Amino acid sequence: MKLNVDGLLVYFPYDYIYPEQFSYMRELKRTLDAKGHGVLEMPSGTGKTVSLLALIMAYQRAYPLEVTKLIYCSRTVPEIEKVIEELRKLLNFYEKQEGEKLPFLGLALSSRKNLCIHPEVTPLRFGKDVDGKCHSLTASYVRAQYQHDTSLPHCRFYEEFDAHGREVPLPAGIYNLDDLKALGRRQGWCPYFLARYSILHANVVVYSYHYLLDPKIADLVSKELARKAVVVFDEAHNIDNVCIDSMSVNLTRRTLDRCQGNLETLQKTVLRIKETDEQRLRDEYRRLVEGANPVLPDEVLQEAVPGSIRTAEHFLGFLRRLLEYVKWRLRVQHVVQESPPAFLSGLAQRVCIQRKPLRFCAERLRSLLHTLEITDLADFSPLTLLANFATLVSTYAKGFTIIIEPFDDRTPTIANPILHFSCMDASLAIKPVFERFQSVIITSGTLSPLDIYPKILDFHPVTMATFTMTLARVCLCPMIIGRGNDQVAISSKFETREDIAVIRNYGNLLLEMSAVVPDGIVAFFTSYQYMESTVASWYEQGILENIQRNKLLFIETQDGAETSVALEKYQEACENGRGAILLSVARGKVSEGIDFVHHYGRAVIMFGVPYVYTQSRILKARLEYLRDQFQIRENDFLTFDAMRHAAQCVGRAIRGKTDYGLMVFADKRFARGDKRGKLPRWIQEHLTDANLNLTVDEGVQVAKYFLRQMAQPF
Amino acid sequence: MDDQGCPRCKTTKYRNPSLKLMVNVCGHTLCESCVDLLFVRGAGNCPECGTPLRKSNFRVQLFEDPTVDKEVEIRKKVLKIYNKREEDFPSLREYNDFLEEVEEIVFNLTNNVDLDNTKKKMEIYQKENKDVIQKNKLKLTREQEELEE
Amino acid sequence: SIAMQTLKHMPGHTSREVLIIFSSLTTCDPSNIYDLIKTLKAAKIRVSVIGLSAEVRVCTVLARETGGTYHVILDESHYKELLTHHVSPPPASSSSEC
Ligand code: SF4
Ligand SMILES: [Zn+2]
């Protein structure tokens, strides 16, 4: 299937493409031709990936100099595996068409924890542990000692890679993570480091955001080599939250105590080092005078001189001083306090800690800790976190804020206070991506309206188009139910949350919808506490028992183990005729991680508009700062945060292969024009005024009829 | 306030955290109910150590670490010296070399004999007090006032 | 299982067929039905479900794997058509033997 695109001719593996695919390809080619960053939305979970990859490959063939390589990022490794599968299929199709191999390379990066071949680190699954063990095995000290070949466990894979892969790079091919593990085992090399080196000469590289956003690890692999590369973020509508998380650092009392203990161990190790080997490790002082990774981005990062902290004892005392200041500032009992610049000024005044020497604290920590030949960085990781916070605060506070919480939420009195350093704007941390890369395409599904995104992230988009899925059959038939059998408002307002009548309306709607809907249904609440309250009310009444009789019921919990077990049983229930009703939370990690396909989550129920609690002070900074700068109304951003989240958690049923399914929102708020307008275009256009505010019974009847229509073949 | 208590009357913490540590030349934890002790007999002598104090050597502090108390006080005194701004020296190394010597002086004063430090500080006094100490001391108020607003 | 017990001893030449008029989408069974699907395929018993007001996934896989056809009632008139269509003998496939 060769498509004569306006720009050029583009190959395509599958037989047919919908008109939305034509529109997507033409808009994407327009953006690439303009060589300017832009954002676009595509409904389908799958199909957009193949269209995007094919268009990028064809554009690379036409103008190889224009684009050096493609950097395609996905939320999670399980998801990016499907992307690499799609890319492998596309490459096989293109190779068959051409008749021969071409110099094209495509690979996926992942954590050493996820992929590695060392038996010692295999049993351990904790990422910091894998990082520390690998650092110990690959340490420059361990490498030098391996040169001596003394009796000591040395990781042969990295040494063999240094010997061989450095000389010879991999010719070409596509390697999934699992297949790359096998390749590393066969060749006695690192599946991780081999891909890391191939990044220098790779046409396509795929990895999650935290491999491309956080300055600590993103920069090293996203160096200026890709000066003009097509960087693409997929389903990255929750990009602001992850970009903020890449900067926010949380300091707790327990973490601070662990830091103090680690610092004591550091002092003891320094004394032992002084008595054992002093001159050779002192040479570090000379190289320092000449002049865990830094959190400072490219331009913000500075390397002039370490500062007044030039020796191990001096640096240790500096950390003692700063840790004492943080300890006391956290121990203070008072209302939540915000102080971005005032915190730095007060630190400098109270404990005599100048911001410039504080700036290089984390970098000097890395160097000095390397000198100590520690067993691993896992033990001292809390200290490195505190050092990263210490350097960040002295680095900048223009678009940041230090929040102190002596008392935690959900606890009238708790002896574990927490100090947050949550960011307020993601533009600060995502600026390097936009500036360095010629064009970035934020391709997303279920995207709340694009107009806000340029305001939140400071960039000038080239194209702003919303693509609506078009099929010969109406795959999706969304509806909103606001009126119950009692013709009573069913809005899940904070003041209306306690309403037993509203809870009863929700329960009855779920009962009837489970009675009619086939096997497999997922209901998303607004919070764990609200979900528990509704479940308890239904349990006190007989509605819950009737729902249990009609279909099996499963519930989500904060604990990941129970969540995984419940979802595993839910899948088997969906396969069998019992069916299942999975209650979950919109913010739950399960909602974002899981993907619902044919005969999975057939009818997506949304109980109440997803709104975060109006007491969490972090969101207060994040929100009022957006009001002050970029001029976004607080209500506007709040409703946007609700609609984007709801679209994320309701857009799964249309994953791909044209699998029918209905999305019912049991809240009259969605019927409001603003919510509908902010809803994604593809869902909204299907939505109509006739079914906009169906009663519970009317919605049930129309759902039954729509399921009848979708049951029959094409 | 998280400390279990004063080494002798460690009662006074599980009493309540209103009281604050009292810094002394001994760098030595104390509480006000114990400051009444130290006044009432001895009048400026550490209970265990017996370190003499001129007038009670008492000032309010809220840092549980006695080493941090001594280090912070010594740094407060030292900052009065070597307060010249960085831009006064065009040399790249000299920006932080003098700060290195300053912190070395602080660590020296914390534990080792301060006689050499005092003699050196007299040497630096005779030169700095003329211009640099006065100028930076006067400019401190100006810069602090501008920074506060 | 009842149908399989009765049809197991039936002659090989005749075509064993089952038409499940499924009404309630739920299926509470003592044992997993996917295992029974294997025995049904081994016994070459055609099973063609006719669902009512539901596109049941387990019955979809049952029909397509066992060789039968799956349908859902659009209305009473279409129900008449479905059953009248099922009246006629089904074509013999490769697994079928005469
Ligand atoms: S050096 Fe390679 S093989 Fe050894 S632990 Fe690290 S990633 Fe695994
Ligand atoms: Zn006392």
Ligand SMILES: [Zn+2]
């Ligand atoms: Zn004492």
